[PDB]
Amino acid sequence: ATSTKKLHKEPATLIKAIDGDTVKLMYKGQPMTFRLLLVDTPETKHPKKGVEKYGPEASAFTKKMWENAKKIEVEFDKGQRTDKYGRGLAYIYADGKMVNEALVRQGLAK
């Protein structure tokens, strides 16, 4: 049995809110930008492109959904640091539900 090293990280605060681009979290008293959240898997038998960017409302969840809904916190890192732009490595948890943002319709709105 291969023991997977899981880092028990603590939750952060609200400093910056963006649609998976750059969100600074209060870690050890210092803010750090982390953006790693991408999941696409529909409930249909054959998983073909899950939910897409429903809207920028996510940035608002950090206000009410952050204080009332399962807000952002850090758990584990991937080990890449840079995925899209290159700003820290961490997933933004919004109201305990991943906003899920990837691609636009089909090809940048065709």
Strands 24-27 and 30-33: antiparallel
Q: Which fold has domain 1-110?
A: OB fold (Dihydrolipoamide Acetyltransferase, E2P) (2.40.50)
What technique determined this structure? NMR
Is residue 105 flagged as an active site residue?
Answer: no
- Of 45, 38, 28, the C-alpha closest to 89 is 38
Domain locations in the chain?
1-110
Task: Write out the two tokens for 82.
Answer: 């840079």
The answer to whether the CB of 15 falls within 8 A of the CB of 8 is no
Output the six-digit token pair for 22. Answer: 């750059």
CB of 38 closer than 8 Å to CB of 25: no
Report the distance separating Cα 110 and Cα 106, nearest Å: 7
Longest CA–CA separation in the chain, Å: 48
82 annotated to bind ligand: no
Contact 98, 91 (CB under 8 A): yes
**Is the separation of the CB atoms in 50 and 39 below 8 Å?**
yes
Contact call for residues 97 and 71 (beta carbons, < 8 A): no
Closest listed residue to residue 38, CA positions, set 4, 84, 69 = 84
Catalytic annotation on 67? Answer: no
Q: Is 40 annotated as a binding residue?
A: yes
